[PDB]
Amino acid sequence: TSNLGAEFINSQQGSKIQESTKNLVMGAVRQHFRPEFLNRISSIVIFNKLSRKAIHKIVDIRLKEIEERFEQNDKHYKLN
Amino acid sequence: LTQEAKDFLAKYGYSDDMGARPLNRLIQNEILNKLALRILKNEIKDKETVNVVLEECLEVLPNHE
């Protein structure tokens, strides 16, 4: 993993990964990460920004797992 | 591979600082992973081809051929 791309993620230019922008990131990664490694690696993968649309699914996912992980159901929520 | 698949790999990947390994990675990432999926989906039961689609893609034997 790496957050080098955070310098570009924070451009906030769309939730999608942008062309050129992502390349500036990968370029910089090579500059700050031996390309020799990256010349063997299956691929560099870039994450989508978590737009509110993403959040609208994530929150439910996380609240559900978070609750499920709370020991035993002696209480828990109805979650309205 | 014809001239074209070979050219797609060369043209898409031939940076002068790359090493041949990225071409090899490219084909694995470009086609072979697609093949793996085609196999898993039974799009490829036996045999296989090469086809060039401009960008690139991989043909199937959709009848589980």
PDB file of C-alpha atoms in Angstrom:
ATOM      1  CA  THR A   1       0.000   0.000   0.000  1.00  0.00           C
ATOM      2  CA  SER A   2       0.655   3.755  -0.461  1.00  0.00           C
ATOM      3  CA  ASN A   3      -0.935   7.201   0.046  1.00  0.00           C
ATOM      4  CA  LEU A   4       1.330   9.039  -2.302  1.00  0.00           C
ATOM      5  CA  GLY A   5      -1.744   9.450  -4.471  1.00  0.00           C
ATOM      6  CA  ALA A   6      -3.438  11.344  -1.618  1.00  0.00           C
ATOM      7  CA  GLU A   7      -1.768  14.470  -3.102  1.00  0.00           C
ATOM      8  CA  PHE A   8      -3.941  13.904  -6.137  1.00  0.00           C
ATOM      9  CA  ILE A   9      -6.966  12.345  -4.389  1.00  0.00           C
ATOM     10  CA  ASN A  10      -7.405  15.611  -2.570  1.00  0.00           C
ATOM     11  CA  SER A  11      -7.974  17.306  -5.928  1.00  0.00           C
ATOM     12  CA  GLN A  12     -11.439  15.867  -5.439  1.00  0.00           C
ATOM     13  CA  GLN A  13     -11.882  15.965  -9.224  1.00  0.00           C
ATOM     14  CA  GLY A  14     -14.742  13.505  -9.501  1.00  0.00           C
ATOM     15  CA  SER A  15     -15.281  10.279  -7.585  1.00  0.00           C
ATOM     16  CA  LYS A  16     -13.752   8.377 -10.462  1.00  0.00           C
ATOM     17  CA  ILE A  17     -10.053   7.910 -11.024  1.00  0.00           C
ATOM     18  CA  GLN A  18      -8.889  10.418 -13.554  1.00  0.00           C
ATOM     19  CA  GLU A  19      -6.544   9.855 -16.439  1.00  0.00           C
ATOM     20  CA  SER A  20      -3.269  11.802 -16.258  1.00  0.00           C
ATOM     21  CA  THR A  21      -3.912  12.520 -12.594  1.00  0.00           C
ATOM     22  CA  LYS A  22      -3.509   8.827 -11.825  1.00  0.00           C
ATOM     23  CA  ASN A  23      -0.443   8.750 -14.009  1.00  0.00           C
ATOM     24  CA  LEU A  24       1.153  11.622 -12.158  1.00  0.00           C
ATOM     25  CA  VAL A  25       0.568   9.559  -9.072  1.00  0.00           C
ATOM     26  CA  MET A  26       2.086   6.402 -10.433  1.00  0.00           C
ATOM     27  CA  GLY A  27       4.979   8.374 -11.892  1.00  0.00           C
ATOM     28  CA  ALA A  28       5.638   9.915  -8.503  1.00  0.00           C
ATOM     29  CA  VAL A  29       5.340   6.525  -6.874  1.00  0.00           C
ATOM     30  CA  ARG A  30       8.079   5.197  -9.123  1.00  0.00           C
ATOM     31  CA  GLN A  31      10.170   8.237  -8.213  1.00  0.00           C
ATOM     32  CA  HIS A  32       9.599   7.429  -4.552  1.00  0.00           C
ATOM     33  CA  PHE A  33       9.427   3.659  -4.874  1.00  0.00           C
ATOM     34  CA  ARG A  34      11.853   1.574  -6.847  1.00  0.00           C
ATOM     35  CA  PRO A  35      10.300   0.978 -10.295  1.00  0.00           C
ATOM     36  CA  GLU A  36      12.226  -2.269 -10.345  1.00  0.00           C
ATOM     37  CA  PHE A  37       9.578  -3.550  -7.958  1.00  0.00           C
ATOM     38  CA  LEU A  38       6.840  -2.004 -10.002  1.00  0.00           C
ATOM     39  CA  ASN A  39       8.292  -3.521 -13.127  1.00  0.00           C
ATOM     40  CA  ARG A  40       7.511  -6.978 -11.713  1.00  0.00           C
ATOM     41  CA  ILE A  41       4.259  -6.235  -9.849  1.00  0.00           C
ATOM     42  CA  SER A  42       1.111  -7.625 -11.482  1.00  0.00           C
ATOM     43  CA  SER A  43      -0.433  -4.158 -11.382  1.00  0.00           C
ATOM     44  CA  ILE A  44      -0.927  -0.901  -9.570  1.00  0.00           C
ATOM     45  CA  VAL A  45      -4.506  -0.529  -8.395  1.00  0.00           C
ATOM     46  CA  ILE A  46      -6.080   2.829  -7.632  1.00  0.00           C
ATOM     47  CA  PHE A  47      -9.080   3.350  -5.374  1.00  0.00           C
ATOM     48  CA  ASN A  48     -12.237   5.317  -6.134  1.00  0.00           C
ATOM     49  CA  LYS A  49     -12.992   8.249  -3.913  1.00  0.00           C
ATOM     50  CA  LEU A  50     -15.729   7.527  -1.435  1.00  0.00           C
ATOM     51  CA  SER A  51     -18.381   9.887  -2.716  1.00  0.00           C
ATOM     52  CA  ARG A  52     -21.501  10.335  -0.691  1.00  0.00           C
ATOM     53  CA  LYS A  53     -23.114   7.904  -3.111  1.00  0.00           C
ATOM     54  CA  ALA A  54     -20.544   5.368  -1.924  1.00  0.00           C
ATOM     55  CA  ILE A  55     -21.229   6.406   1.647  1.00  0.00           C
ATOM     56  CA  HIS A  56     -24.891   5.760   1.206  1.00  0.00           C
ATOM     57  CA  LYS A  57     -23.969   2.063   0.944  1.00  0.00           C
ATOM     58  CA  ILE A  58     -20.937   2.061   3.237  1.00  0.00           C
ATOM     59  CA  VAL A  59     -22.679   3.376   6.250  1.00  0.00           C
ATOM     60  CA  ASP A  60     -25.167   0.575   6.213  1.00  0.00           C
ATOM     61  CA  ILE A  61     -22.448  -1.944   5.663  1.00  0.00           C
ATOM     62  CA  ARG A  62     -20.389  -0.671   8.490  1.00  0.00           C
ATOM     63  CA  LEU A  63     -23.140  -0.108  10.951  1.00  0.00           C
ATOM     64  CA  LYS A  64     -24.327  -3.605  10.280  1.00  0.00           C
ATOM     65  CA  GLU A  65     -20.927  -5.223  10.766  1.00  0.00           C
ATOM     66  CA  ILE A  66     -20.125  -3.023  13.724  1.00  0.00           C
ATOM     67  CA  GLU A  67     -23.275  -4.103  15.438  1.00  0.00           C
ATOM     68  CA  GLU A  68     -22.817  -7.754  14.564  1.00  0.00           C
ATOM     69  CA  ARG A  69     -19.361  -7.693  16.098  1.00  0.00           C
ATOM     70  CA  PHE A  70     -20.716  -6.441  19.452  1.00  0.00           C
ATOM     71  CA  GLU A  71     -20.343  -9.595  21.483  1.00  0.00           C
ATOM     72  CA  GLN A  72     -23.778 -11.159  21.818  1.00  0.00           C
ATOM     73  CA  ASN A  73     -27.283  -9.930  21.105  1.00  0.00           C
ATOM     74  CA  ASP A  74     -28.310  -9.184  24.682  1.00  0.00           C
ATOM     75  CA  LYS A  75     -29.401  -5.793  23.438  1.00  0.00           C
ATOM     76  CA  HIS A  76     -28.208  -4.435  20.113  1.00  0.00           C
ATOM     77  CA  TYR A  77     -30.490  -2.286  17.979  1.00  0.00           C
ATOM     78  CA  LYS A  78     -33.650  -2.182  15.932  1.00  0.00           C
ATOM     79  CA  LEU A  79     -31.714   0.567  14.073  1.00  0.00           C
ATOM     80  CA  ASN A  80     -34.389   2.931  12.806  1.00  0.00           C
TER      81      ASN A  80
ATOM     82  CA  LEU B   1      -0.795 -12.723 -32.540  1.00  0.00           C
ATOM     83  CA  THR B   2      -0.483 -11.493 -36.075  1.00  0.00           C
ATOM     84  CA  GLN B   3       1.270  -8.195 -36.505  1.00  0.00           C
ATOM     85  CA  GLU B   4      -1.424  -6.491 -34.480  1.00  0.00           C
ATOM     86  CA  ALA B   5      -1.493  -8.233 -31.108  1.00  0.00           C
ATOM     87  CA  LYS B   6       2.242  -8.050 -31.078  1.00  0.00           C
ATOM     88  CA  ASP B   7       2.083  -4.387 -32.010  1.00  0.00           C
ATOM     89  CA  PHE B   8      -0.443  -3.648 -29.353  1.00  0.00           C
ATOM     90  CA  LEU B   9       1.886  -5.013 -26.758  1.00  0.00           C
ATOM     91  CA  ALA B  10       4.875  -3.222 -28.193  1.00  0.00           C
ATOM     92  CA  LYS B  11       3.162   0.066 -28.860  1.00  0.00           C
ATOM     93  CA  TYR B  12       1.142   0.110 -25.687  1.00  0.00           C
ATOM     94  CA  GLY B  13       4.073  -0.793 -23.514  1.00  0.00           C
ATOM     95  CA  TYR B  14       7.405   0.120 -25.131  1.00  0.00           C
ATOM     96  CA  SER B  15       8.794   2.765 -22.869  1.00  0.00           C
ATOM     97  CA  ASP B  16      12.504   2.902 -23.309  1.00  0.00           C
ATOM     98  CA  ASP B  17      13.039   2.615 -19.527  1.00  0.00           C
ATOM     99  CA  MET B  18      10.693  -0.344 -18.967  1.00  0.00           C
ATOM    100  CA  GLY B  19      12.620  -3.669 -19.220  1.00  0.00           C
ATOM    101  CA  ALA B  20      10.862  -6.513 -21.128  1.00  0.00           C
ATOM    102  CA  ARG B  21       9.095  -7.639 -17.990  1.00  0.00           C
ATOM    103  CA  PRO B  22       6.284  -5.042 -18.271  1.00  0.00           C
ATOM    104  CA  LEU B  23       5.438  -6.392 -21.697  1.00  0.00           C
ATOM    105  CA  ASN B  24       5.078  -9.756 -20.129  1.00  0.00           C
ATOM    106  CA  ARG B  25       3.118  -8.301 -17.278  1.00  0.00           C
ATOM    107  CA  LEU B  26       1.047  -6.406 -19.777  1.00  0.00           C
ATOM    108  CA  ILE B  27      -0.041  -9.453 -21.618  1.00  0.00           C
ATOM    109  CA  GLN B  28      -0.866 -11.134 -18.341  1.00  0.00           C
ATOM    110  CA  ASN B  29      -2.824  -8.066 -17.277  1.00  0.00           C
ATOM    111  CA  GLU B  30      -4.235  -7.347 -20.705  1.00  0.00           C
ATOM    112  CA  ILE B  31      -5.361 -10.762 -21.844  1.00  0.00           C
ATOM    113  CA  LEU B  32      -4.378 -13.602 -19.689  1.00  0.00           C
ATOM    114  CA  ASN B  33      -6.451 -12.452 -16.729  1.00  0.00           C
ATOM    115  CA  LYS B  34      -9.376 -12.163 -19.120  1.00  0.00           C
ATOM    116  CA  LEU B  35      -8.633 -15.686 -20.201  1.00  0.00           C
ATOM    117  CA  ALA B  36      -8.706 -16.860 -16.652  1.00  0.00           C
ATOM    118  CA  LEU B  37     -12.121 -15.366 -16.287  1.00  0.00           C
ATOM    119  CA  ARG B  38     -13.281 -16.801 -19.584  1.00  0.00           C
ATOM    120  CA  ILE B  39     -12.153 -20.173 -18.356  1.00  0.00           C
ATOM    121  CA  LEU B  40     -13.887 -19.766 -15.037  1.00  0.00           C
ATOM    122  CA  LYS B  41     -17.088 -18.725 -16.816  1.00  0.00           C
ATOM    123  CA  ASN B  42     -16.662 -21.735 -19.132  1.00  0.00           C
ATOM    124  CA  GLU B  43     -16.364 -19.333 -22.067  1.00  0.00           C
ATOM    125  CA  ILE B  44     -13.160 -21.263 -22.723  1.00  0.00           C
ATOM    126  CA  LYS B  45     -13.450 -25.021 -22.112  1.00  0.00           C
ATOM    127  CA  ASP B  46     -10.781 -25.970 -24.663  1.00  0.00           C
ATOM    128  CA  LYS B  47      -8.787 -24.237 -27.402  1.00  0.00           C
ATOM    129  CA  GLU B  48      -8.594 -20.375 -27.458  1.00  0.00           C
ATOM    130  CA  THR B  49      -7.766 -17.590 -29.924  1.00  0.00           C
ATOM    131  CA  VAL B  50      -6.232 -14.227 -30.240  1.00  0.00           C
ATOM    132  CA  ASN B  51      -8.174 -11.340 -31.511  1.00  0.00           C
ATOM    133  CA  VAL B  52      -7.394  -7.666 -31.572  1.00  0.00           C
ATOM    134  CA  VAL B  53      -9.933  -5.063 -30.554  1.00  0.00           C
ATOM    135  CA  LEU B  54      -9.180  -1.388 -30.551  1.00  0.00           C
ATOM    136  CA  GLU B  55      -7.751  -0.611 -26.076  1.00  0.00           C
ATOM    137  CA  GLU B  56      -7.756  -4.451 -26.269  1.00  0.00           C
ATOM    138  CA  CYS B  57      -9.992  -7.490 -25.500  1.00  0.00           C
ATOM    139  CA  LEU B  58     -10.300 -11.309 -25.680  1.00  0.00           C
ATOM    140  CA  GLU B  59     -12.698 -13.485 -27.719  1.00  0.00           C
ATOM    141  CA  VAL B  60     -14.613 -16.464 -26.310  1.00  0.00           C
ATOM    142  CA  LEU B  61     -15.758 -19.941 -27.204  1.00  0.00           C
ATOM    143  CA  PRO B  62     -19.142 -19.119 -25.616  1.00  0.00           C
ATOM    144  CA  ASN B  63     -20.698 -22.525 -26.207  1.00  0.00           C
ATOM    145  CA  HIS B  64     -18.096 -23.926 -23.813  1.00  0.00           C
ATOM    146  CA  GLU B  65     -15.901 -24.868 -26.717  1.00  0.00           C
TER     147      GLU B  65
END
